[PDB]
Ligand binder design. Structure first.
Ligand code: MG
Length: 179
């Protein structure tokens, strides 16, 4: 059983992009943040704790355009109860066609690895966007590196990566670009 169902008609000819959440698109903290973008109540051992979420600059534009260009899949190492409510608030456009969480990762040598072979998509047409090189150790030639983001509001990395993804969305084989 693959991680994804069969691609829907509106997605099957597009490249599939696996997108990480934490430190890629947003940064979440248990420490109080003034002027947070979202605050999500998360229950741990029956006690509610407020999680403070900041959005990376240019993420709305980035997520909107990627949802058009690609079959977008949220693939996080975190548990659904962190990731789900954040995605709900973030994905205004139905960009994420599927959500995969901690259970879907392989724990390999102390790292959560996102194993692209389990997806059920032709790997010539799969990309991964993740701030942790560790998550794509099995598929390093499918990857578009992005720097870890915490709270730097001068960051332009999501914006500067768009022309590149614009190009990748049109190719037949991602490996002809990434090697
Ligand atoms: Mg991350």
């Amino acid at each position: 059983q693959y991680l994804l169902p069969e691609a829907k008609a509106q997605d099957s000819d597009k490249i599939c992009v696996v997108i990480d959440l934490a430190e890629t698109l947003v940064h979440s903290s248990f420490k109080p943040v003034n002027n947070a973008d979202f605050i999500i109540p998360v229950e741990i051992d029956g006690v509610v704790h407020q999680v403070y979420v900041l959005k990376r600059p240019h993420v709305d534009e980035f997520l909107q355009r990627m949802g058009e260009l690609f079959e977008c899949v949220l693939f996080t190492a975190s548990l659904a109860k962190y990731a789900d409510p954040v995605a709900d608030l973030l994905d205004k456009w139905g960009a994420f066609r599927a959500r995969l969480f901690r259970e879907s990762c392989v724990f390999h040598r102390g790292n959560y690895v996102k194993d692209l072979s389990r997806l059920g998509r032709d790997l010539r047409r799969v990309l991964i966007l993740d701030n942790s090189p560790a998550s794509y150790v099995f598929h390093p030639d499918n990857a578009v590196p992005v720097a870890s983001w915490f709270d730097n509001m001068s960051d332009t990395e999501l914006h500067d990566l768009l022309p590149f993804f614009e190009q990748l969305s049109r190719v037949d084989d991602v490996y002809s670009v990434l090697r």
